């Protein structure tokens, strides 16, 4: 199998119009879990989570998230006091781990205030990088608690990876499947003076795809226009790459997807 990841986000909003607090988990690109201050319930966002986790998992994470919602509200208020900030600001957390293709693992923990990097954890040095002087205040309090640092390292390296592996199995039929891209090249007079070659891929899962244009099969082209990997709405994805050319060199589109390389010459 390829790289997989498990990520959990927290968003807090002071004086919403919007919920005060939302939490969502993701395995790769797939929402698996949700919770907000309005439902006050942890719910599955994937059928294969609903079907493999007994009610007591949802009931127990419901209670933990009610806790995290309260801690986040208090923490946010504190950050706005530290800043002399009034009215609405956002506190954000992201925790997660990757199980890479080579079996090696990563872990990350970071916070954002109003969508900016506030605090980033290094689980190797057991330390928080602070962007400013209020960050550097929280850095201190946090780095004074060795039990918390070590708990976090252990969470990211052992628990997170064990959860990710648990959820990978539950969702294998979705997460470890391949829908190979359908790729078409066409040549279009797009506008007056402009003739272009489009290499368009769609129907693909997973979303990670590399598309480029080659000249005489040697040189990668420098002037390529790229279409974002975009969700099609059916659980598959679509993307393109295009180059402009002299109406009269052999150009080739190269697509790499899920361990398969594909060449289309015009």
């Amino acid at each position, epitope marked *: 199998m390829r790289t997989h990841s498990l990520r959990y986000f927290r968003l807090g909003v002071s004086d919403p119009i919007v919920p005060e607090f939302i939490s969502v988990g993701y395995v790769d690109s797939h929402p698996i879990t949700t919770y907000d201050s309005v439902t*006050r319930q942890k719910e599955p966002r994937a059928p294969w989570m609903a079907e493999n986790l007994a009610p007591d998992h949802w009931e127990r994470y419901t209670q933990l998230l009610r806790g995290w919602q309260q801690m986040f509200k208090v923490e946010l208020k504190r950050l706005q006091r530290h800043y002399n900030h009034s009215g609405s600001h956002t506190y954000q957390r992201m925790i997660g781990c990757e199980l890479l293709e080579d079996g090696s693992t990563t872990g990350f923990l970071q916070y954002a205030y109003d969508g900016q990097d506030f605090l980033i954890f290094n689980k190797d040095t057991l330390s928080w990088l602070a962007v400013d002087n209020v960050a550097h205040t929280i850095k201190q309090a946090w780095e004074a608690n060795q039990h918390e640092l070590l708990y976090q390292k252990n969470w990211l390296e052992e*628990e997170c990876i064990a959860w990710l592996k648990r959820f990978l199995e539950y969702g294998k039929d979705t997460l470890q499947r391949t829908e190979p891209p359908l790729v078409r090249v066409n040549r279009k007079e797009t506008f007056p003076g402009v003739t272009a070659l489009f290499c368009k891929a769609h129907g693909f899962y997973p979303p990670e795809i590399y598309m480029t244009w080659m000249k005489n099969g040697e040189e990668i082209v420098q002037e390529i226009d790229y279409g974002d990997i975009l969700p099609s709405g059916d659980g598959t994805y679509q993307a393109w790459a295009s180059i402009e050319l002299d109406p009269q060199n052999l150009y080739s589109c190269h697509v790499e997807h899920s361990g398969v390389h594909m060449v289309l010459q015009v």
Partner: antibody, heavy 109, light 112 residues
């Protein structure tokens, strides 16, 4: 998040050393605690281990092997005041706190 | 600071109701109620992850709780039974994984 075993009772001489073993079986782990409870009083926190190894705090040390499902609380230069029950507890993957039945430590003068 | 648990001692008749009170001034989110019985580990009756929520522990039957505030976590005995003769400990913790701070206990005896 299943099982935890410690000795019911240990007896050692004042001035000497005791090692209180705690063995645990779990699928999921967020750390192992030692608490001290004197006769007729509330438990108080002694130690936390989550990574493999030895943490020293004065006369008291707490060891964890995560792979062997194994912790010990080591008490040096035993005093009469160390007489008390020692409670081993661990957190499972869901932060359930599973408590040992406790070990009663009897110090002989 | 710490955990203030009352009463320290209590005798009840079979069938009588009571409330053990428990207050902490530490801003802790987590409060717990345990019973301690000879030869077994602490058994959780109910817990509260924060103000506005509560959930059952391992031995909730015959008890109830409220957590309308951060500070207080009261334990209600519905109908005193002799099986409820025990020492009750209130506890708080900053977080689900942080150390517990305990109250000084309630020694409770229920007689017919």
């Amino acid at each position: 998040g299943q099982n935890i075993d410690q000795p019911t009772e240990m007896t050692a001489t004042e001035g000497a050393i005791v090692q209180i073993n705690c063995t645990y079986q779990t699928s999921g782990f967020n750390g192992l605690f030692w608490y001290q409870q004197h006769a007729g009083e509330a438990p108080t926190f002694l130690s936390y281990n989550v990574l493999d190894g030895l943490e020293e705090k004065g006369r008291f040390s707490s060891f964890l092997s995560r792979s062997k499902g194994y912790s010990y609380l080591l008490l040096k230069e035993l005093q009469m005041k160390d007489s008390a029950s020692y409670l081993c507890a661990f957190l499972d993957s869901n932060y359930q706190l599973i408590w040992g039945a406790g070990t009663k430590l009897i110090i002989k003068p | 600071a710490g955990v203030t648990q009352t009463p320290k001692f209590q005798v009840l008749k079979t069938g009588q109701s009571m409330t053990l009170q428990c207050a902490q001034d530490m801003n802790h989110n987590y409060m717990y109620w345990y019973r301690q019985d000879p030869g077994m580990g602490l058994r959780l009756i109910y817990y509260s992850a924060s103000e506005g929520t509560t959930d059952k522990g391992e031995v909730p039957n015959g008890y109830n709780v409220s957590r309308s505030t951060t500070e207080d976590f009261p334990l209600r005995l519905l109908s005193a039974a002799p099986s409820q003769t025990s020492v009750y400990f209130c506890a708080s913790s900053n977080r689900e994984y942080s150390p517990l701070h305990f109250g000084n206990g309630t020694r409770l005896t229920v007689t017919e």
